[PDB]
Enzyme design. Structure first.
Site, PDB file in Angstrom:
ATOM      1  N   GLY A  34       0.726  -1.260   0.000  1.00  0.00           N
ATOM      2  CA  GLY A  34       0.000   0.000   0.000  1.00  0.00           C
ATOM      3  C   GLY A  34       0.756   1.312   0.000  1.00  0.00           C
ATOM      4  N   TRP A  36       2.294   3.121  -2.464  1.00  0.00           N
ATOM      5  CA  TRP A  36       1.927   4.041  -3.518  1.00  0.00           C
ATOM      6  C   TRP A  36       0.529   4.617  -3.299  1.00  0.00           C
ATOM      7  CZ3 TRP A  36       3.767   2.899  -9.155  1.00  0.00           C
ATOM      8  CH2 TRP A  36       5.174   2.935  -9.190  1.00  0.00           C
ATOM      9  N   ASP A  54      -3.965  -6.096  -6.234  1.00  0.00           N
ATOM     10  CA  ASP A  54      -2.761  -6.906  -6.015  1.00  0.00           C
ATOM     11  C   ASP A  54      -3.246  -8.323  -5.774  1.00  0.00           C
ATOM     12  OD1 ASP A  54      -0.188  -8.131  -4.683  1.00  0.00           O
ATOM     13  OD2 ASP A  54       0.376  -6.057  -4.983  1.00  0.00           O
ATOM     14  N   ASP A  70      -5.622 -11.877  -9.329  1.00  0.00           N
ATOM     15  CA  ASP A  70      -4.564 -11.981 -10.317  1.00  0.00           C
ATOM     16  C   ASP A  70      -4.928 -11.091 -11.509  1.00  0.00           C
ATOM     17  OD1 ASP A  70      -2.654 -12.785 -12.146  1.00  0.00           O
ATOM     18  OD2 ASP A  70      -2.729 -14.885 -11.453  1.00  0.00           O
ATOM     19  N   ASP A  95       3.263  -0.759 -10.281  1.00  0.00           N
ATOM     20  CA  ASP A  95       4.514  -1.172  -9.646  1.00  0.00           C
ATOM     21  C   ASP A  95       4.547  -2.690  -9.627  1.00  0.00           C
ATOM     22  OD1 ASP A  95       7.010  -0.497  -8.514  1.00  0.00           O
ATOM     23  OD2 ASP A  95       6.195  -0.716  -6.454  1.00  0.00           O
ATOM     24  N   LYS A 135       6.714   0.491 -13.642  1.00  0.00           N
ATOM     25  CA  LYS A 135       8.019  -0.110 -13.278  1.00  0.00           C
ATOM     26  C   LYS A 135       8.364  -1.077 -14.417  1.00  0.00           C
ATOM     27  CE  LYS A 135       8.496  -2.855  -9.358  1.00  0.00           C
ATOM     28  NZ  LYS A 135       9.394  -2.177  -8.371  1.00  0.00           N
TER      29      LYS A 135
END
Ligand SMILES: C[S@@+](CC[C@H](N)C(=O)[O-])C[C@H]1O[C@@H](n2cnc3c(N)ncnc32)[C@H](O)[C@@H]1O
Ligand SMILES: [Hg+2]
Ligand SMILES: [Hg+2]
Length: 180
Positions: A34, A36, A54, A70, A95, A135
């Site tokens: 958590g 970000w 997530d 997922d 990310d 990322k």
């Protein structure tokens, strides 16, 4: 420390690129635990909101609609879109990174699949003029992915936050001004 390394990397990006503004709606991919989302809430304020995702569970955050699943599953996409609704999304941030085996010829394809999924969602939900931060790892696939992002945005920068480990092959592509 009071905040995670990930939180500090996003603070560095906000300082350099000024992505987050009051009241925005943001999508946060690979959000756990958590950092970000916690950082973005301080910038978008109580009237903005985040739709986060997530595979792992995370603590709830007021202003964040968190879905655990997922992201590779078409079904999870559907459910995320249900939380976005007709809200215009000004920033899509990702990310996400895969469980890494240690072998680049394996880990890089796994990672690139996730950022390709992040870009596909960006194409589908990011409003014109919006931003995308993702990322990505140095290596195979990086050139083509950066070129694709450059063709979709007016400005693109490759950032290596000081809080990002020097030994890490990661960089953050920061794109602004989603083209019509
Ligand atoms: C670097 S961590 C995220 C840190 C986060 N930005 C923060 O500030 O706490 C990467 C996350 O990507 C998530 N991830 C990897 N593959 C995923 C997938 N298929 N679907 C959803 N999340 C995924 C992981 O479970 C991991 O929590
Ligand atoms: Hg999810
Ligand atoms: Hg996009």
């Amino acid at each position: 420390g009071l905040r995670s390394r990930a939180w500090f990397k996003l603070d560095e990006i906000q300082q350099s690129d000024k992505l987050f503004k009051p009241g925005m709606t943001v999508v946060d991919l690979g959000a756990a635990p958590g950092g970000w989302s916690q950082y973005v809430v301080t910038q978008i304020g109580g009237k903005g909101r985040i739709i986060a995702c997530d595979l792992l569970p995370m603590d709830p955050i007021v202003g964040v609609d968190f879905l655990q699943g997922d992201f590779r599953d078409e079904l999870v996409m559907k459910a995320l879109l249900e939380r976005v609704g007709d809200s215009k999304v000004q920033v899509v941030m990702s990310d996400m990174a895969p469980n890494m085996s240690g072998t680049p010829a394996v880990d890089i394809p796994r990672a690139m699949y996730l950022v390709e999924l992040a870009l596909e969602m960006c194409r589908d939900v990011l409003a014109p003029g919006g931003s995308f931060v993702v990322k990505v790892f140095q290596g195979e696939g990086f050139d083509e992915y950066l070129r694709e992002i450059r063709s979709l945005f007016t400005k693109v920068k490759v950032r290596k936050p000081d809080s990002s480990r020097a030994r890490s092959r990661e960089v953050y592509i920061v794109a602004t001004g989603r083209k019509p």
